[PDB]
Amino acid sequence: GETFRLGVLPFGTASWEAAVIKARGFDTANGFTLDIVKLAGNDAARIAFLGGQVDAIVGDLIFAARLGNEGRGVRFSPYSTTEGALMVPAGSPITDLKGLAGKRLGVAGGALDKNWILLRAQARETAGLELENVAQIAYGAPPLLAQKLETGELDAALLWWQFAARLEAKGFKRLISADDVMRAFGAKGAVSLIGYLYEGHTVADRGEVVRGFARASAAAKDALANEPALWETVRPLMAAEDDATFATLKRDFLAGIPRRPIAAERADGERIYAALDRLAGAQLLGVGKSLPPDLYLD
Numbered sequence: 001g002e003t004f005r006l007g008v009l010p011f012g013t014a015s016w017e018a019a020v021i022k023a024r025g026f027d028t029a030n031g032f033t034l035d036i037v038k039l040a041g042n043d044a045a046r047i048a049f050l051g052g053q054v055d056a057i058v059g060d061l062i063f064a065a066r067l068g069n070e071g072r073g074v075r076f077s078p079y080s081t082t083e084g085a086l087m088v089p090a091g092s093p094i095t096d097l098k099g100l101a102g103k104r105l106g107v108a109g110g111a112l113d114k115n116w117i118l119l120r121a122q123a124r125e126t127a128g129l130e131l132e133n134v135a136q137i138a139y140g141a142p143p144l145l146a147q148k149l150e151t152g153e154l155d156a157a158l159l160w161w162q163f164a165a166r167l168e169a170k171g172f173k174r175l176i177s178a179d180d181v182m183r184a185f186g187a188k189g190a191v192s193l194i195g196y197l198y199e200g201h202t203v204a205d206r207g208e209v210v211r212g213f214a215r216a217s218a219a220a221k222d223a224l225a226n227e228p229a230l231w232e233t234v235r236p237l238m239a240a241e242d243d244a245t246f247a248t249l250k251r252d253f254l255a256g257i258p259r260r261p262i263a264a265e266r267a268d269g270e271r272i273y274a275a276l277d278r279l280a281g282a283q284l285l286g287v288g289k290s291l292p293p294d295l296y297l298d
């Protein structure tokens with residue numbers, strides 16, 4: 001038949017809907033077999049994608065835009081409008097971004113993470129501060145940063161949303177989300193910065209497998225949003241034995257399910273990007289002043 005190789009991170013949320021697609025036969029329903037390919041980290045996943053070893057990964061719009069500017073045929077489709085979360089210890093004196101001054105601040109995903117670009121942009125706009133000038137920044141993969149915030153080696157951390165949910169039950173609070181920054185900018189609606197990235201070659205030569213997968217994913221998200229029993233099936237993949245954690249993960253995932261037309265999604269992306277290029281020109285030097293053309297999957 002047709003196999004679609006999807007690269008997933010072991011601490012990512014993409015595995016959850018991939019497991020629904022397989023369990024419910026939504027790949028079969030669309031004439032293909034989904035092969036879930038476990039990749040160690042985001043840097044490993046990005047290389048496998050550059051190396052043509054998968055048909056898709058989950059990644060951010062900026063990286064997709066950068067790969068487009070750098071010459072790739074990558075196509076983006078919205079995966080979630082839920083992204084980022086600045087976590088501080090409960091009762092933290094930090095009530096504003098200025099409070100980060102003189103603190104050890106973890107940043108998940110490195111110096112070019114989409115959440116970091118947004119946070120830096122928000123801080124320059126609302127206070128003319130360069131967080132990298134005042135805060136002791138520590139870059140690293142999300143699991144490490146979550147662990148070090150728990151152990152007190154860090155005073156705050158910008159983490160992927162799933163980790164923030166688990167930290168609340170360890171006595172941690174969300175100072176701000178990446179969704180917060182973007183509503184502060186004045187975005188028209190919920191905006192997906194996390195997407196499926198489809199390989200240019202697969203789009204060109206196996207376009208129906210791509211559409212079949214995109215349909216399978218939307219059906220899985222739809223099922224998760226309409227069948228509360230289905231969640232207890234995927235719980236083993238969620239690392240959520242704790243009950244308040246499980247409920248918080250479910251609530252944030254549901255809130256993130258993209259429900260806006262690609263046209264509206266693409267237009268908010270273009271505007272939010274051009275706003276960020278004015279506040280974070282250096283970090284996006286690999287991407288350009290504007291989003292590549294035809295980046296969004298039709």
Ligand SMILES: O=C(O)c1cc(C(=O)O)c2c(n1)C(=O)C(=O)c1cc(C(=O)O)[nH]c1-2
Nearest residue numbers: 008009012013014058059060083084160161
């Ligand atoms: O900022 C975030 O909250 C967030 C969440 C997730 C996620 O849903 O696991 C990903 C990312 N970011 C991300 O940038 C990324 O490349 C990614 C890959 C995967 C995955 O499951 O394979 N999740 C995510």
Ligand SMILES: [Cl-]
Nearest residue numbers: 001002003004
């Ligand atoms: Cl095949």
Ligand SMILES: [Cl-]
Nearest residue numbers: 039040041044
């Ligand atoms: Cl790997």
Ligand SMILES: [Cl-]
Nearest residue numbers: 072073074200
């Ligand atoms: Cl590509």
Ligand SMILES: [Cl-]
Nearest residue numbers: 030215216219
């Ligand atoms: Cl379908």
Ligand SMILES: [Cl-]
Nearest residue numbers: 280281282283
């Ligand atoms: Cl910059």
